Design a protein around this ligand. Structure first.
Ligand SMILES: CCn1c2c(c(=O)[nH]c1=O)[C@H]1C(=C(C)N2)C(=O)OCc2ccccc2OCCCOc2ccccc21
Length: 127
């Protein structure tokens, strides 16, 4: 298949913690983006077969998507908020690497990223 195995959403050897910040990342940040009208291209791994993107995984070697992030949060996979924030940033960075400025998918990502950053601005201090 053109598609690689998707990123793991569990791993018994991965170290993990729960924190108030990770809780906010699920309850606020992920939920807000997940329900947005532009979420759908980002709700699951990029499917190069369905989407006719035979070059996608020649270019994008660190794939990430919000379906994976959602499951990682639900599974308490992360050690800290930074790991989760990094996954969101990988997703956006991949979109801007693969697609051209001004493309519809880029306009969608930019709207989601603006909202992401508005929610991150209110991330509680860890306690
Ligand atoms: C986030 C991953 N992604 C992605 C896309 C893309 O172009 N670049 C990406 O990085 C595709 C895409 C997804 C899910 N995802 C998608 O549903 O296409 C549909 C499609 C399937 C079969 C043939 C041609 C098709 O559409 C032609 C228009 C150009 O495609 C667009 C346009 C707007 C939004 C998304 C996309």
């Amino acid at each position: 298949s053109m598609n690689p195995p998707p990123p793991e959403t569990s791993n018994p050897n991965k170290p993990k913690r729960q924190t108030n910040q990770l809780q906010y990342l699920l309850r606020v940040v992920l939920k807000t983006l997940w329900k947005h009208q532009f979420a759908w291209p980002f709700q699951q791994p990029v499917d190069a077969v369905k989407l006719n993107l035979p070059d996608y995984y020649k270019i994008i070697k660190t794939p990430m998507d919000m379906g994976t992030i959602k499951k990682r949060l639900e599974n308490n996979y992360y050690w800290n908020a930074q790991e989760c924030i990094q996954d969101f940033n990988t997703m956006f960075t991949n979109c801007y690497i693969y697609n051209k400025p001004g493309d519809d998918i880029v306009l969608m990502a930019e709207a989601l990223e603006k909202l992401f950053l508005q929610k991150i601005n209110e991330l509680p201090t860890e306690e």
